[PDB]
Amino acid sequence: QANLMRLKSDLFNRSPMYPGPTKDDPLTVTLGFTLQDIVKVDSSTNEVDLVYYEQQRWKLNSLMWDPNEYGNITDFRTSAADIWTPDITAYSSTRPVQVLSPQIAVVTHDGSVMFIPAQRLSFMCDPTGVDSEEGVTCAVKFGSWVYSGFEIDLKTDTDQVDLSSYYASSKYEILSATQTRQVQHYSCCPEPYIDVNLVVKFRERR
Amino acid sequence: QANLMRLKSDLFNRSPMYPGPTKDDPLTVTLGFTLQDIVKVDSSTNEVDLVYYEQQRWKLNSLMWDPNEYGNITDFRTSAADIWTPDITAYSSTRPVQVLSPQIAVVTHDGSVMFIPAQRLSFMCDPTGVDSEEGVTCAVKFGSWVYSGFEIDLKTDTDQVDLSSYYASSKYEILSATQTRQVQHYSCCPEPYIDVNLVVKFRERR
Amino acid sequence: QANLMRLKSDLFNRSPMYPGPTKDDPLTVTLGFTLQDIVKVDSSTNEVDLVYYEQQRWKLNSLMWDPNEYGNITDFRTSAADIWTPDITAYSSTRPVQVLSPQIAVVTHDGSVMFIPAQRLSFMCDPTGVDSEEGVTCAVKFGSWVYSGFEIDLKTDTDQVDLSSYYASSKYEILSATQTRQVQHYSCCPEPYIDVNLVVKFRER
Amino acid sequence: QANLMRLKSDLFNRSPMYPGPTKDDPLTVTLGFTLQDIVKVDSSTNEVDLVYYEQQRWKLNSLMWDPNEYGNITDFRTSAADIWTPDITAYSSTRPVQVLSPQIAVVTHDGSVMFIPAQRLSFMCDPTGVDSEEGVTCAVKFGSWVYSGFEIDLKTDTDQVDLSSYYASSKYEILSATQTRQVQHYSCCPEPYIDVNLVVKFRER
Amino acid sequence: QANLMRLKSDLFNRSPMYPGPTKDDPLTVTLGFTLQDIVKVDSSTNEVDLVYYEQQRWKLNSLMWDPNEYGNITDFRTSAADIWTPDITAYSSTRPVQVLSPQIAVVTHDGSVMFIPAQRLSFMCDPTGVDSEEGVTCAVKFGSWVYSGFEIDLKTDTDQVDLSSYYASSKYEILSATQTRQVQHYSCCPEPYIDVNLVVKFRERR
Numbered sequence A, B, E: 001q002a003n004l005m006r007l008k009s010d011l012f013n014r015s016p017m018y019p020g021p022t023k024d025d026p027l028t029v030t031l032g033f034t035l036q037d038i039v040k041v042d043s044s045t046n047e048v049d050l051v052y053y054e055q056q057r058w059k060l061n062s063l064m065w066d067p068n069e070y071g072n073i074t075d076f077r078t079s080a081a082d083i084w085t086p087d088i089t090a091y092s093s094t095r096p097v098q099v100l101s102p103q104i105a106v107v108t109h110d111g112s113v114m115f116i117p118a119q120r121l122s123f124m125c126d127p128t129g130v131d132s133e134e135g136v137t138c139a140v141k142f143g144s145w146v147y148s149g150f151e152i153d154l155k156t157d158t159d160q161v162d163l164s165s166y167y168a169s170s171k172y173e174i175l176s177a178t179q180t181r182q183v184q185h186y187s188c189c190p191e192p193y194i195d196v197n198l199v200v201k202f203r204e205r206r
Numbered sequence C, D: 001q002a003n004l005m006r007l008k009s010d011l012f013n014r015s016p017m018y019p020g021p022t023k024d025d026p027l028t029v030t031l032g033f034t035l036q037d038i039v040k041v042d043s044s045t046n047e048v049d050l051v052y053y054e055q056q057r058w059k060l061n062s063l064m065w066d067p068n069e070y071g072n073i074t075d076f077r078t079s080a081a082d083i084w085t086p087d088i089t090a091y092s093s094t095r096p097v098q099v100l101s102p103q104i105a106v107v108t109h110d111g112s113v114m115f116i117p118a119q120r121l122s123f124m125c126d127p128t129g130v131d132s133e134e135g136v137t138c139a140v141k142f143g144s145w146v147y148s149g150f151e152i153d154l155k156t157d158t159d160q161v162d163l164s165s166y167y168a169s170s171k172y173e174i175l176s177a178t179q180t181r182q183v184q185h186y187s188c189c190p191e192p193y194i195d196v197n198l199v200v201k202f203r204e205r
């Protein structure tokens, strides 16, 4: 604009597409959840539905630029189609995830990307005891579906989920909520795979 | 149409795509809601469903033209794909929004655009008390998901929502409906983000 | 096929896309409905679901050709993607419309197009009294969403909806069904907008 | 694969796309149904849901080749996107049809195509009497939506639907099932349109 | 990485698309299921809903490369769009399958591909007797929809379904689960068609 249009041109159209991470140029994705609502519980199927937004951060050398060569531009918004994004996936979903926010990300001159999709998720959770004082506890792992730890590592900035935006008049009160890095192994493949395990504890409101 | 086909060619095909707003060339979007129906209430999940159309207006120098150079044409309809549109998003939705109108916008010679999507929206709202005289109040914020106030500002032409087309046989009567600009901050980011807060107060009819 | 492939090439690939109608070159779309079923009624939300097909006709000079220059071809079927179509839209829908027929249209050498989408539609309608003798009446307007009357006019060939293909064992019987041109005004805009108002009166049993 | 990749190249990429049939180069589609399950019945609406796969066969000169010129290849599988397919459409559906099988077809050197989509279909059917010994009978017509009989004809190899794969523990027993060619006429158009009428008779267990 | 972008270019953009298998160059796909949950049962329609992921393996000469010619790269992740995939299909589904995992596969230098879609599946199954001690048994065949045994053969690495990741608090307990190769014939066609028959026996938990 002229600078931003040129910048995006140089970054995207004039290089071949970034082919994702590898054992030789791996990545670390930082995840953090903001829980907005436990919407629904179904005790006949043991499905529970969450609404949250999930903050993703990572960094690529292929997205770096010098602001002085581009009119002192330090960052920009762009369609998530223009860039690689990680295949962060819920391991116990029961319906495809529904996206609630536009697919746009923020890129910064140092190569860092931030992307914060809002989602509705149905997952496997037995709510028995939700009607009590002690409440019930459920959990779901998030991680790359296809990339091992040697390609994609995960971390959290804090193990405390953000509950400052939780709907004050939800049918369910959140007692506590945790996000914790973990390591899994699968029969398909030799390497360790990384997830962040979201653990919520909740109950019917007074 | 000779002139119109040429005009659209000159504007779209012969310039590079407008890359969205920035801190240096920011925008103001004007929003106004027209509420058509409160369709459904679900007291088991605290979700409520609205149908409205949402008027958006903004202006771009990159869409200006001189009507004399183009057969005294002052405006035209065009696919919303041909142009940039703002990522106006509901902050407490619980299902993806459903679009009820075609994705076509109106562009005027002075650069102004008008775009009025019709939508059905499920959002977080506790209807307890709806069956009473006093009714119940619920609220949902609309704003850019990814653009700060330094890129996208919002305003309303009036803080009264338009109820002139509200369904006369809806199960719910509107007592009041309000659209009001506000400023938020989030954990992700230092900058201020702008929303318009739609506040409806309603009850079972008779 | 030689001729038809060439014809379509000449019409579509070798001209710039028709940019829709304007105040200087406006259009008239002719609409007619064929009601097949009232499927469902929901008294708890006042939504009612219809299945119909909706006949659209209009005409463009940019789609004319001389049959002699193209092997005496007078018409052809083509994907609705290949051509401009009008943005005919239900003003009181409560869910996106669901399409039940393929998106293919008929173009004739004189420039006329015919396009008949089948749809299921949920719209705002209070069914109270449907269980009675007198039945109940509901209505929904169809028209362009974005084009004024100075760009798109509507007309019907007849104000009687076509009930010749209505499901004989539907849960609801049609007492009358009407399609009538009308004029509306909106807060956004000074110009008049045109619809055809479909008015159905029906009952159980 | 050398030969097959070349063959497909010669057929698809090096000719212009086949523009569908016409009065001068019409075709005949052969239809046959295999009923797998009556899944659901809804007596509140009078919708009933079927799962079947529908066999389609037709033939095009534009898909012929000589197997000697291509390594003695007599046929191949290909994406249904690569080829024209007929717009066979249920006239009394109440929801868009859901596709349960991949969209791949078989082409043979003589130009014949075979395509067998599996579908779930909701259609207009009143189940009253389903709970009895005699059961109930319902019907739905399948045919081209936009092509007349002068462009697309239909036939069946047999009027007996194939029930050898019907789910033995469905909630509903099929008593009988029929597929029969028919001719319809419409107010839009002068020409006759062709369907195959699927007629099922069934009951609760 | 330079090498990977080039590799993918050489494999995909610079060859004509692989046209699937034939009688002269047939394939064998290896299938294995990992059952995660029996989610729901509907006795009014005899539909039952499963969540599993299905491991697919096969091998193509057209996907081979020499790691030395490409910076000692032995494998990579890629969009399933970039490659042929087999048309493995459930013969008694009642709704389209819902995909729960991203559509990405792993390719290895020897030409082998691995692809593991997660799915939710509604299929024809009568649950009468599920409430008892003996439980009930249901079955669904998976195989190519269009390719005969002379084009696509199937095999399993083991006839035991993997129940190591089955939801411990599902409403239904698995008594046994089996995956077994089998041969069918159809009226359309003279050739034999191959499936793997997944047979599950289950009951209400207690």
Ligand SMILES: O=c1cccc2n1C[C@@H]1CNC[C@H]2C1
Pocket (backbone or CB within 6 Å): A144, A145, A146, A147, A186, A188, A189, A193, E053, E106, E115, E116, E117
């Ligand atoms: O699709 C792949 C591809 C590679 C590896 C795996 N999967 C799927 C399973 C869940 N993710 C980890 C592991 C098993």
Ligand SMILES: O=c1cccc2n1C[C@@H]1CNC[C@H]2C1
Pocket (backbone or CB within 6 Å): A053, A106, A115, A116, A117, B144, B145, B146, B147, B186, B188, B189, B193
């Ligand atoms: O995706 C982004 C991108 C940039 C900023 C933000 N988000 C998501 C949240 C909602 N909007 C404001 C803030 C937090």
Ligand SMILES: O=c1cccc2n1C[C@@H]1CNC[C@H]2C1
Pocket (backbone or CB within 6 Å): B053, B104, B106, B115, B116, B117, C144, C145, C146, C147, C186, C188, C189, C193
């Ligand atoms: O989108 C437009 C664009 C132009 C005009 C209008 N709309 C939407 C509303 C319904 N139709 C008339 C009016 C208001």
Ligand SMILES: O=c1cccc2n1C[C@@H]1CNC[C@H]2C1
Pocket (backbone or CB within 6 Å): C053, C104, C106, C115, C116, C117, D144, D145, D146, D147, D186, D188, D189, D193
């Ligand atoms: O779409 C067309 C196009 C041409 C003719 C027709 N239709 C649809 C209706 C059903 N088929 C026959 C008739 C009416």
Ligand SMILES: O=c1cccc2n1C[C@@H]1CNC[C@H]2C1
Pocket (backbone or CB within 6 Å): D053, D106, D115, D116, D117, E144, E145, E146, E147, E186, E188, E189, E193
């Ligand atoms: O679509 C085809 C194409 C070829 C063969 C078949 N079908 C479908 C049915 C199920 N698969 C085997 C057989 C019958």
Ligand SMILES: [Cl-]
Pocket (backbone or CB within 6 Å): A001, A002, A003, A004, A071
């Ligand atoms: Cl600039």
Ligand SMILES: [Cl-]
Pocket (backbone or CB within 6 Å): B001, B002, B003, B071
């Ligand atoms: Cl002109």
Ligand SMILES: [Cl-]
Pocket (backbone or CB within 6 Å): none
């Ligand atoms: Cl509903």
Ligand SMILES: [Cl-]
Pocket (backbone or CB within 6 Å): none
């Ligand atoms: Cl729901």
Ligand SMILES: [Cl-]
Pocket (backbone or CB within 6 Å): B101, B102, B103
């Ligand atoms: Cl649209």
Ligand SMILES: [Cl-]
Pocket (backbone or CB within 6 Å): C001, C002, C003, C004, C071
């Ligand atoms: Cl010809």
Ligand SMILES: [Cl-]
Pocket (backbone or CB within 6 Å): none
């Ligand atoms: Cl329904």
Ligand SMILES: [Cl-]
Pocket (backbone or CB within 6 Å): D001, D002, D003, D004, D071
């Ligand atoms: Cl060969």
Ligand SMILES: [Cl-]
Pocket (backbone or CB within 6 Å): none
């Ligand atoms: Cl259902």
Ligand SMILES: [Cl-]
Pocket (backbone or CB within 6 Å): D205
């Ligand atoms: Cl029974």
Ligand SMILES: [Cl-]
Pocket (backbone or CB within 6 Å): none
């Ligand atoms: Cl459900």
